[PDB]
Amino acid sequence: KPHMNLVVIGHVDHGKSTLVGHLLYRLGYIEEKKLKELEEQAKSRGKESFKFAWILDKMKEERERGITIDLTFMKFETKKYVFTIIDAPGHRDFVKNMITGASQADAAILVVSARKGEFEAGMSTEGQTREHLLLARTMGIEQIIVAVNKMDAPDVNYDQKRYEFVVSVLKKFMKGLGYQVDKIPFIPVSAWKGDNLIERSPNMPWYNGPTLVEALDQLQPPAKPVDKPLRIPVQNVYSIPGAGTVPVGRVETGVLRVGDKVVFMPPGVVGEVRSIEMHYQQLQQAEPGDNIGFAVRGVSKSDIKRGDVAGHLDKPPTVAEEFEARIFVIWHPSAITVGYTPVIHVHTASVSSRIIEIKAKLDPKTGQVVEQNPQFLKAGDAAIVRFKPVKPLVVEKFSEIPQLGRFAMRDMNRTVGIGIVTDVKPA
Amino acid sequence: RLTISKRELARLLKELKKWSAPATVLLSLYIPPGRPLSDVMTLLRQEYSITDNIKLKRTRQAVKRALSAAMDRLQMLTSTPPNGLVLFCGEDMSTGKFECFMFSPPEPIRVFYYRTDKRFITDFLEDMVEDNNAIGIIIVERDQATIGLLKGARLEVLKELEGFVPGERIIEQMVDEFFKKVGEEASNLLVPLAEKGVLKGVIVAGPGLAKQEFVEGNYLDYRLKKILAPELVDVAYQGLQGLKEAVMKAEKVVEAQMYRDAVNAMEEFKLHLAKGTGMIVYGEKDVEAALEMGAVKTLLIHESREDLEEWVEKAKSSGAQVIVVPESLAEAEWFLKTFGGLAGILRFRIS
Ligand SMILES: Nc1nc2c(ncn2[C@@H]2O[C@H](COP(=O)(O)OP(=O)(O)OP(=O)(O)O)[C@@H](O)[C@H]2O)c(=O)[nH]1
Ligand SMILES: [Mg+2]
Numbered sequence: 001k002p003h004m005n006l007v008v009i010g011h012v013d014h015g016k017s018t019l020v021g022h023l024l025y026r027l028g029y030i031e032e033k034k035l036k037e038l039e040e041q042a043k044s045r046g047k048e049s050f051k052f053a054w055i056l057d058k059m060k061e062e063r064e065r066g067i068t069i070d071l072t073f074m075k076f077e078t079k080k081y082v083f084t085i086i087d088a089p090g091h092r093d094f095v096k097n098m099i100t101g102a103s104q105a106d107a108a109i110l111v112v113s114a115r116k117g118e119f120e121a122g123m124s125t126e127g128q129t130r131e132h133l134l135l136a137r138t139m140g141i142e143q144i145i146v147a148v149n150k151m152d153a154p155d156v157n158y159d160q161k162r163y164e165f166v167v168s169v170l171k172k173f174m175k176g177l178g179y180q181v182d183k184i185p186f187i188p189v190s191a192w193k194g195d196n197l198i199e200r201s202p203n204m205p206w207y208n209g210p211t212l213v214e215a216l217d218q219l220q221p222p223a224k225p226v227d228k229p230l231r232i233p234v235q236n237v238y239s240i241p242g243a244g245t246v247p248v249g250r251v252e253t254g255v256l257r258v259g260d261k262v263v264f265m266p267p268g269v270v271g272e273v274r275s276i277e278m279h280y281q282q283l284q285q286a287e288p289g290d291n292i293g294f295a296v297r298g299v300s301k302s303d304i305k306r307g308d309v310a311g312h313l314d315k316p317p318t319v320a321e322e323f324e325a326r327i328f329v330i331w332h333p334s335a336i337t338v339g340y341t342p343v344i345h346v347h348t349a350s351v352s353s354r355i356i357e358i359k360a361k362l363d364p365k366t367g368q369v370v371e372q373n374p375q376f377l378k379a380g381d382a383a384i385v386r387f388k389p390v391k392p393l394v395v396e397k398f399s400e401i402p403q404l405g406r407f408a409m410r411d412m413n414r415t416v417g418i419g420i421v422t423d424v425k426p427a
Numbered sequence: 428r429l430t431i432s433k434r435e436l437a438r439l440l441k442e443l444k445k446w447s448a449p450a451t452v453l454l455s456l457y458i459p460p461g462r463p464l465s466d467v468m469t470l471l472r473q474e475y476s477i478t479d480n481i482k483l484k485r486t487r488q489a490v491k492r493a494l495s496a497a498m499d500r501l502q503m504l505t506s507t508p509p510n511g512l513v514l515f516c517g518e519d520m521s522t523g524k525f526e527c528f529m530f531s532p533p534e535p536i537r538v539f540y541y542r543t544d545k546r547f548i549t550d551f552l553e554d555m556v557e558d559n560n561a562i563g564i565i566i567v568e569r570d571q572a573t574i575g576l577l578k579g580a581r582l583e584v585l586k587e588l589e590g591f592v593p594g595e596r597i598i599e600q601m602v603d604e605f606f607k608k609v610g611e612e613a614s615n616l617l618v619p620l621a622e623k624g625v626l627k628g629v630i631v632a633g634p635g636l637a638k639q640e641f642v643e644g645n646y647l648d649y650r651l652k653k654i655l656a657p658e659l660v661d662v663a664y665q666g667l668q669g670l671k672e673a674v675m676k677a678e679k680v681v682e683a684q685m686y687r688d689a690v691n692a693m694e695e696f697k698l699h700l701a702k703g704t705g706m707i708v709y710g711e712k713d714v715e716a717a718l719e720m721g722a723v724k725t726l727l728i729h730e731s732r733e734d735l736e737e738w739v740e741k742a743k744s745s746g747a748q749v750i751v752v753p754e755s756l757a758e759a760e761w762f763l764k765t766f767g768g769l770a771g772i773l774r775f776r777i778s
Contacts, residue, residue: 059594061569061635061636061637064636065635065636069635070594092663093634093635093661093663094634094663095663096663096664236594238593238594239591239593239596239597239598239599240597241597242595243595244595244596244597245596245598297595300596300598301591301596301598302591302598305589333694333698334694334695334696334697334698334700334701335697335698335700335701337697337758337761338760338761338764339757339758339759339760339761340757340758341667341757343664343668352666352667352668354757375700375765376697376700376701378701390666390667411668412671412672412675413662413663413664413672
């Protein structure tokens with residue numbers, strides 16, 4: 001049964017965690033006694049409507065504020081697939097976390113509230129339906145399902161006109177991003193009631209498409225590049241009684257087996273795999289797509305962090321002394337010059353990088369040079385630029401390992417530009 | 428010709444404080460503006476006369492030499508520059524090198540001052556360069572912190588920390604413990620500056636609640652706590668990105684207004700470029716031209732220009748706000764290579 005990684009994305013409060021939680025529940029992955037206890041705890045803290053969300057949101061600050069802060073990973077299994085599902089935050093402060101999530105994903109569920117004002121807000125200039133869609137594209141997610149959520153809400157009440165309104169807006173925007181919009185399901189659901197999650201909803205007779213589970217089965221599994229050299233960007237590092245220090249991350253390329261000797265770049269520390277675990281099931285090998293924790297003998301937690309990359313010793317992950325990229329500028333309030341230093345979000349990493357030169361401005365559609373060494377770039381421009389990371393950074397050429405070779409540029413907490421790396425000068 | 432800027436002074440001050448001599452043979456000399464240099468000259472001469480009274484030969488020679496090299500650098504000037512002159516001259520004992528530095532300070536000197544000592548006497552120049560407006564910045568998250576420092580438009584990371592708060596060898600930290608760690612580390616870096624009177628404020632920044640808990644707790648030394656900015660600033664990132672975010676957003680701290688002005692000017696400069704408004708004058712001629720007309724609303728000067736002080740002077744009279752672009756600023760080198768580090772923004776068009 002093929003495995004897939006699913007990221008759940010969308011604007012703050014639109015219903016991401018409630019969807020995932022409620023889906024896991026009616027699919028029977030969550031103990032009724034636990035759902036009962038969560039509900040009681042939720043009511044007693046003034047937050048009844050967070051009972052499904054609190055399956056995913058566990059941190060003290062998440063519960064206090066009623067928001068997701070960082071990623072949560074859950075295994076569930078449909079008729080055709082086994083999914084690792086990744087719950088991502090909508091809050092603008094934590095889009096860096098959502099991005100690491102997208103970098104690990106094969107497909108995305110975009111959760112979009114149909115509630116009056118909630119939709120418009122998410123799709124507004126500085127909204128996260130807009131931003132998350134953009135970032136998901138740049139991190140290389142092609143398969144997308146959209147859950148038009150909260151159909152149950154009184155200000156919505158299962159209205160097909162409201163639904164078709166959000167669908168059309170979403171379609172015009174998504175097509176401008178390069179999505180193949182004709183192929184993607186727009187399912188009207190209620191993450192809270194359950195409508196169209198797993199079974200079909202009587203409240204919405206006018207809807208003929210897949211339910212969300214059906215839509216999942218209609219996805220297609222991605223290429224498994226087992227013959228390219230091992231690369232595992234670390235998403236987090238735990239220190240675990242019995243195991244020791246265990247990096248977690250999704251195997252992008254190559255294969256990893258217990259016994260293997262592995263190196264973590266850019267620090268250059270080397271350890272040896274004691275064990276491998278996916279969703280609490282011990283493994284002996286892990287292949288691309290596997291989202292795993294791997295115990296490492298001889299490595300201290302302080303040696304390694306998120307955004308580090310693990311490969312085998314003979315073909316270690318490339319550390320960029322500098323690198324070259326083709327970029328498009330989504331948004332900027334003035335202009336970008338040589339010297340401009342946004343943070344680069346690539347795979348699980350995020351490191352400020354200085355533009356040391358702008359070799360050429362390109363026509364954004366054709367790719368031809370329109371000017372050698374432009375005096376600056378502005379919103380709407382495309383370019384070939386050189387980048388020097390402020391601290392050691394791992395990147396690969398897009399042509400070689402695309403999952404370590406696509407990136408976003410962010411500055412003053414906004415997404416400014418997008419990029420693919422066309423060349424790397426190794427450290 | 429001689430006048431240096433405050434940045435150029437601070438750099439020099441760092442070299443001068445290394446100079447030492449086994450006896451009182453380093454010459455320090457401060458001449459207020461408008462002193463007939465022929466009168467300073469008469470004084471150095473009377474000083475020279477007294478040198479033969481110095482019994483120790485190697486001392487007497489080191490002093491004669493320094494007075495001569497001073498009387499030489501002086502002989503070349505007709506009169507003093509607008510802010511007066513300072514001269515430091517003698518041979519450094521550990522290195523062996525002999526030099527006679529001469530320059531005019533950013534600000535005017537108010538007393539005549541002559542001294543031979545084992546070191547150069549730089550106090551007046553130290554007081555001239557410390558503006559006593561430093562702001563400490565601490566960005567706190569549950570498992571990350573960044574400590575940085577703001578003086579003027581110069582922003583810098585002093586220390587980054589990552590803790591062991593969870594989301595053979597086993598390591599593990601509670602939030603409370605990482606906060607204590609962060610606090611101590613911030614204190615060691617910042618409390619010294621607070622005592623020299625340099626540090627006027629501490630900003631606490633970061634995403635969400637962790638920054639509030641960090642303040643409420645007993646992590647930060649009381650002396651830092653006394654100069655806390657009232658408003659916590661929400662920012663998403665760590666490191667320099669985080670620091671910039673925090674400084675831009677801390678609108679109620681006056682010591683940060685300078686950095687904001689530098690960043691906002693460069694942004695208005697770039698806007699004009701991107702919108703093709705043509706309200707930007709550059710080149711010394713056109714800048715001088717526009718300046719003479721009172722046309723320039725804001726002048727941007729790269730701190731590394733030698734004639735920096737000339738233009739700073741011209742601007743204040745011309746009606747132009749000044750912005751000194753420091754080499755730390757992101758656009759600094761581009762502004763230097765592409766516009767020679769000198770450009771104004773017009774408040775009205777010339778053509
Ligand atoms: N009426 C109605 N309310 C919903 C529905 N789904 C979620 N909500 C409510 O919307 C609020 C936000 O729910 P969350 O699941 O935390 O939204 P989220 O996108 O996952 O949250 P963030 O990660 O913080 O952006 C909660 O109070 C939910 O009860 C729905 O289908 N119908
Ligand atoms: Mg959530």
